[PDB]
Amino acid sequence: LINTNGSWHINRTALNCNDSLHTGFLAALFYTHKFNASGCPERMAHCRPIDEFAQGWGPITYAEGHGSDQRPYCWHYAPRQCGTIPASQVCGPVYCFTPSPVVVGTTDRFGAPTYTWGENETDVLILNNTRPPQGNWFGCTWMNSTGFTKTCGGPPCNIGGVGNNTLTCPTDCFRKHPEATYTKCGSGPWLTPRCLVDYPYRLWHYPCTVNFTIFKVRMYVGGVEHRLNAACNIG
Amino acid sequence: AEVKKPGSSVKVSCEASGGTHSNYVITWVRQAPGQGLEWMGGFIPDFRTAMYAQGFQGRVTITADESTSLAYMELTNLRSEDTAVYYCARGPLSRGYYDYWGPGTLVTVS
Amino acid sequence: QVQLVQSGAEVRKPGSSVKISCKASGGTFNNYALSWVRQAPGQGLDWMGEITPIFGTEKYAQKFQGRVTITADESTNTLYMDLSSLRSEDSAVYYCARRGYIYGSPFDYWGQGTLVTVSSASTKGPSVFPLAPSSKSTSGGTAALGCLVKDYFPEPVTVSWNSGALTSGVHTFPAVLQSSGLYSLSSVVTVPSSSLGTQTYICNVNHKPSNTKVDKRVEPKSCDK
Amino acid sequence: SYVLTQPPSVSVAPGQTASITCSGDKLGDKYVSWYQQRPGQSPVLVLYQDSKRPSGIPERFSGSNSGNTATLTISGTQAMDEADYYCQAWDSSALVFGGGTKLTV
Amino acid sequence: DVLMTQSPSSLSASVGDRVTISCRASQSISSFLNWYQQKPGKAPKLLISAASSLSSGVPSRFSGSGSGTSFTLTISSLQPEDVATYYCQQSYSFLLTFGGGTNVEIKRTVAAPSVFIFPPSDEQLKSGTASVVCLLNNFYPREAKVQWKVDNALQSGNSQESVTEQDSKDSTYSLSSTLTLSKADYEKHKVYACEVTHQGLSSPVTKSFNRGEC
Ligand SMILES: *[C@@H]1O[C@H](CO)[C@@H](O[C@@H]2O[C@H](CO)[C@@H](O[C@@H]3O[C@H](CO)[C@@H](O)[C@H](O[C@@H]4O[C@H](CO)[C@@H](O)[C@H](O)[C@@H]4O)[C@@H]3O)[C@H](O)[C@H]2NC(C)=O)[C@H](O)[C@H]1NC(C)=O
Ligand SMILES: *[C@@H]1O[C@H](CO)[C@@H](O)[C@H](O[C@@H]2O[C@H](CO)[C@@H](O)[C@H](O)[C@H]2NC(C)=O)[C@H]1NC(C)=O
Ligand SMILES: *[C@@H]1O[C@H](CO)[C@@H](O[C@@H]2O[C@H](CO)[C@@H](O)[C@H](O)[C@H]2NC(C)=O)[C@H](O)[C@H]1NC(C)=O
Ligand SMILES: *[C@@H]1O[C@H](CO)[C@@H](O[C@@H]2O[C@H](CO)[C@@H](O)[C@H](O)[C@H]2NC(C)=O)[C@H](O)[C@H]1NC(C)=O
């Protein structure tokens, strides 16, 4: 059978999701439990609020090689700068943040688009973090085959500073170093320490942000102006 | 619609056009005359996955196309208990509530 | 098989505003990205802005400093672009281009383009003058006649000789904006000298906005002879 | 399985308040939405996320959910608020529709 | 910004040859390039996608290749209707950019120009304006110089020229140089002429008409 009459979204995506371990992550694509029933709060317990992290000093640097195997459901993280990935280890689309969301598709090997539903030996997602001021995106997230969230973006921005739990800033760590922003230090969907870029599959990737409230924000990157929706809570 | 002779098939064309289309979960609901609603299944245009109702785990069969229509079911083996009005709704991705219920469709069987 | 259809040409004044529509005949704007591309005469294409419905996102090129505002109406299925503070340099053809929402897609559909004319002038009628031939020139075996259409506004002016009977050997040049902000163009025709005795050398200048229609006769061997 | 319980019917006088209860097992942790269906019409969403309401719905409509019960409270009833109301919840990859409570003024 | 450069600015070739058009991006853009063709007074049309893919319905004579910071398009057998402007566009950054455009032409044997001069009519004379038109008919190549001389004196910044598009059946051009002078300036001189210099002429041509003769 052919791919489609073009249909450049049903093809060009990695539809290889298996859950023999009944975690029920494809079931929660329709509904979502409360912040309590989903059992996030103990998951959220291990990362602390932005208030008491540390104080940044002097200039700014860059760092990579971080990344503790977990689910990135927190405002801080070090997404371990991205690279090419096969199409057999990805479930669902791959939204990469310009910050304006962009859906990346399967690119065969070097630069060849493919339309085999992402199931072939060579079908591969060629996503490479690079600051949009020099083209490309900041970073992006997707769910691996078995049903775990994964993320990867530009070299996770450190904030010049130290502590017992120094922050490997992935986004807009303001009031610590007044240079962090989603143009120099931003990696993933998290525009600000308390809300992500709103895209259709935001809740699925982060299933315990249900109590977040929509909001309209705008910012200029490179030579373009972006009108975007950010879903923030509390603030 | 006329009587679909016992042991037939029926298609429910949802003519589903609501909100932002692709990123909007389709669904289906069946209401018997004066008996309240009951679920039948769901569907997602991007992830070609068709969740099934436990009571209708066998007969419900979802097939659709990329366009704003052609999304429907195929409920076979009609029986008197299947006489009802079917409504198509289009909710957001994972909020749960089914906003913008569509016009109903009556189905009868002898 | 979408066919984007735009509106007719607009003539405006400095400091005014314009709103151009783009309707997708036989198609739908949802599930796509819509961009506006302008082409100034004698220049390359330029990118105005973009709107993505499903993402609810809008990107406006900072070249147009906030004057561009795009919107979409699904009920009517139309794409509106509003430009305010129309300066003189805004005169151009505006196209609507449709793209996919996946990274790096090509503009696979365009609109015909809507001419925008930003000039301070009032609709004026044309003036028709005859370009009668010199006798010595007529003696050369081939001669030419014309009727210079002068000082009209706005475009376009169609010239047809003998109600379009003469088409071969007719060279209607493009219009030129005179320094006084008024147009001027010529439609010359060349025919054998032998025929010049015949009388089929009246041009038909037609202008719609001015509701003008002039039939001027170019006299062979005019003046003394 | 899961079961949601609501009163069969309610009767009130004009201008007064009416309360409809949808009760279930530990329903305080399941999001509940309220639908209103007039006679022979496709339902319409009047409340989602228990308390929140969509645009175009009067502020008179109110709802809440806690403990094991969810209430739909309407203040100042009139002849234009006579219609069945249904309570909806999601449980264990299944959709549950509570019983209909007919409101008559 | 990803500035793009297209070369050559304008090229001319006969019918049945092969023409190569080079585009180059300021920085690596992987395989996100597209080639558009726009005929005069028409919306641009997409030709090549992915920097090497051929769209549906496009004639097979267009081929594309390249990667990184080097892209090329080629027409193997140039056709009469392949005359247009060609643009290269990069879709690698959110700020779309286009190439500088390249103009294609058709070659043929050089043709000599024919010069005519038209005196101003009486009707326009008494309106305070006088227009003298010098016409160049069916010549080739396009490059041609026209100068207006009134009483063997060269004029500057007082005439405007208009050139028609290339003839589709003869592949020859035409030109008209118009000189505008008020009545006050028109009644002071006696000699008018237009001088044309072109490749197909051994020596420059000059057509003159005496003032008045009425
Ligand atoms: C995107 O930015 C990246 C910059 O680091 C890079 O993308 C990949 O980066 C990883 C490291 O982060 C590299 O992985 C290579 O994997 C391929 C096979 O998948 C190998 O060719 C290569 O092998 C290593 O290098 C030598 C052979 O090339 C060999 O001598 C070594 O012993 C070792 O085997 C790497 O392991 C690689 O840089 C990038 N991988 C791929 C698949 O692109 C790219 O620079 C950039 N993207 C592109 C398209 O350039
Ligand atoms: C449920 O959601 C809200 C959180 O704002 C609140 O109703 C509950 O807070 C928890 O309630 C616990 C009682 O079951 C009690 O330990 C404490 O108040 C609080 N504990 C937390 C948040 O860890 C949330 N939980 C429950 C179980 O209702
Ligand atoms: C999905 O993948 C396969 C598809 O058939 C299923 O079978 C298991 O595949 C994993 C692959 O890592 C093996 O390790 C298991 O041993 C397979 N199960 C067997 C042989 O019983 C399985 O349903 C899913 N597995 C995973 C990992 O998602
Ligand atoms: C997956 O892609 C590969 C190559 O991209 C296909 O493998 C071979 O492709 C070459 C060139 O077309 C031909 O020899 C055959 O088409 C393929 N030979 C094989 C598979 O032995 C492959 O067909 C594609 N599909 C799958 C399911 O692997």
Give the technique used to solve this structure. Answer: cryo-EM
Task: Give residue limits of the domains in chain B.
Answer: 1-93
Do chains C and E touch, with touching meaning 3 or more CB–CB pairs less than 8 Å apart? yes
Domain D9-99, classified CATH 3.20.20.70, yes or no: no
| Residue pair C59/E94 in contact by the 8 Å Cβ criterion | yes
Nearest residue in E to A99, CA atom: E94
Strand C10-12 relative to strand C114-118: parallel, antiparallel, unpaired? parallel
Pick from D29, D31, D64, D66 the residue to mutate for probing ligand 2's pocket: most ligand atoms within 8 Å of its CB. D29
Chain A residues in contact with B47 by the CB 8 A cut-off are: 15, 17, 26, 29, 92
Token pair, residue D18, equals 């009416």
Q: Which segments within C13-120 are labelled E, that is strand?
A: 17-25, 33-39, 45-52, 57-61, 68-73, 78-84, 92-99, 114-118
Q: Please report, as a single letter, which amino acid is at residue D1.
A: S
Comparing CA positions, the residue from C94, C118, C36, C33 lying closest to residue C69 is C36
Comparing CA positions, the residue from E143, E145, E142 lying closest to residue E134 is E145
Partner D, chain B 27-86, Cβ-Cβ below 8 Å: 29, 36-39, 42, 51, 53-54
How close B83 gets to chain D, by Cα (Å)?
16
**Domains recognised in chain E with CATH numbers:** 4-106 (2.60.40.10), 114-210 (2.60.40.10)
CATH code of C127-217, in short, is 2.60.40.10
Partner chains of A (3+ C-beta pairs under 8 Å): B, C, D, E
| C-alpha dihedral (C104, C106, C109, C114), degrees to nearest 10 | 80
Nearest residue in C to E53, CA atom: C106
Which of the four CATH numbers 2.60.40.10, 2.70.98.30, 2.60.120.560, 3.60.20.30 does domain C3-118 have? 2.60.40.10
Task: Give residue limits of the domains in chain A.
Answer: 1-189
Q: Which segments within chain E are labelled E, that is strand?
A: 4-7, 10-13, 19-25, 33-38, 45-49, 53-54, 62-67, 70-75, 85-90, 97-98, 102-106, 114-118, 129-139, 144-150, 159-163, 173-182, 191-198, 205-210
Q: Residue E9 pairs with which residues in a beta bridge? A: none
Secondary structure of residue C103 in the 3-state scheme: coil
Record the resolution, in angstroms.
3.2
Strand E102-106 relative to strand E10-13: parallel, antiparallel, unpaired? parallel
Secondary structure of residue D103 in the 3-state scheme: strand
| Residue pair C80/C48 in contact by the 8 Å Cβ criterion | no
SS3 readout for chain A = CCCCCCCCCCCCCEECCCCCCCCCCCHHHCCCCCCCCCCCHHHHCCCCCCCCCCCECCCCCCCCCCCCCCCCCCCCCCCCCCCCEECCCCEEEEEEECCCEEECCCEECCCEECCCCCCCCCCEECCCCCCHHHCCCCEEEEECCCCCEEEEECCCCCCCECCCCCCCCCCCCCCCCCCCCCCCCCCCCEEECCEEECCCCHHHHCCCCCCCECCEEEEEECCEEEEEEEEECCC
Task: Give residue limits of the domains in chain D.
Answer: 9-99
Chain B residues in contact with C53 by the CB 8 A cut-off are: 20
Radius of gyration over every alpha carbon of chain A, rounded to an integer in angstroms: 18
CA distance C174 to C184: 9
CATH topology of domain B1-93: Immunoglobulin-like (2.60.40)
CA distance A235 to E72: 52
Chain C residues in contact with E114 by the CB 8 A cut-off are: 142
CA distance A80 to A152: 6
Partner B, chain A 166-225, Cβ-Cβ below 8 Å: 200-201, 203-204, 207, 210
